[PDB]
Design a protein around this nucleic acid. Sequence first.
RNA 1: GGCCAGGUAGCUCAGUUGGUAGAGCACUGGACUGAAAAUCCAGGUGUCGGCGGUUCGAUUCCGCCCCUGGCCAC
Length: 436
Amino acid sequence: XXXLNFYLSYFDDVAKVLPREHYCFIVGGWVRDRILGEPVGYNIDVDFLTTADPVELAKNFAKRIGGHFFVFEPTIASVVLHLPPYRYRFDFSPLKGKDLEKALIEDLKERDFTANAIAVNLDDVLTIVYDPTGGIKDLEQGLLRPVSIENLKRDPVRVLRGFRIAIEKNLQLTEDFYEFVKEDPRIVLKSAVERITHELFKIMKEKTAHKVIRELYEYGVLEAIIPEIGRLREVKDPLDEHTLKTLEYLEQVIEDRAKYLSAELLENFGKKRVLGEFTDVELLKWGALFHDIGKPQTTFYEHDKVGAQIVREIGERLRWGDEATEFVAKLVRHHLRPFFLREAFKKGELKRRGMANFWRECGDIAPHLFLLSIADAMASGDEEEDIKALMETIAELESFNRNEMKXXXXXXXXXXXXXXXXXXXXXXXXXXXXXX
RNA sequence: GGCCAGGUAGCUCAGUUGGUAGAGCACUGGACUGAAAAUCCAGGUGUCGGCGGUUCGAUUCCGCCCCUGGCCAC
């Protein structure tokens, strides 16, 4: 054990439920988050270790705060409270033993990292902390240290969390972690697939993510999870450096998306929800990772379609959404289109036909496609003239869409009259002529 | 409570832009057979999980539910 800021309102609701003879402990992330003094976000996650009945506790607590109560999995209980601006999650876990303190420490020693192993008493919050793993000492040094490499081997998905949190909380992972990763990167494959997928996305969520992705490529964890990435190396132009730099540039372009896309294209950008907590932005970055996955398979003619099917296979395997992998695949197939239309514009051969076709085929990925094309044009070292030509091409497409665009009898006649419309009796006579 | 994948004949499974339904085991009858095996030919009354919505037309598109399975601490 080592010795106001730790306060959360709903902790009161924990005290008005929890019995007089039972004790409660605040454990894990929320402590670390607060020790770092990091801003409490709109998403709040708190973890508890209680000596009372987790089911009863969570039930009455949930009835108090007006959230939904549920249990899963050493069964752990949870309460979820969700309204549009803020979302709370409280995980309640059982703590049993003859000795309280010994049991608490016993639990804390099993956790993934030092900073996560810190715990406090709920009553002292409403300040003596428990960190047998010496978390705080590492937090002062800006270090993220696994409690044991055995703990990381027991639950290999933690190996991914290390990469995430270190970037997310801006900490430096210690040496034994990287050493152990170097040993067997493949270890992550021991835990469940959906957890790896979820962590991968959670990494793709933050804007420094390209650094972590590079770390996963160099340490070969990414290859272990996504084998098709390793096949970017066998072809020399450096393709892997090209794609990773394409990703970094895509994040830069994403931050600059306001000055590139028009207002109507920026309107709904980022609003598509995938896997519940993630947006089409993550899908954009994933699209940047896979933007050329087809070059090793095939000058490379068909590599975009091949890319699409490969991405589809990956989405199938890694248990993404159907709509998520569909979106990313569609993003990959069309990845070279703005360059083609750019080539049509530079020679002045681009007209209403090609624009109409472009907005017909894919209008949904248009902003994503534009940003991605810009990023790729940056990573390939295109001359400034070419870049500006591309951005003016994009300008022309948006300019075209914004203003300049304004048994079977039903099936063919309706479609034909709708196509011809894109004057009742006249059109009727036209349909009558269309019949013969 | 959240995400993901499935729901189609008794069992078990296909079906990328909307039309009228498909296989195999199994089951019934029949044929070659002293007999049978096994093989060939014929037989599917399916509220395409459920109720609405757009369409003349929904297994397919959209919306809301039901059921089964997989995941959900740090």
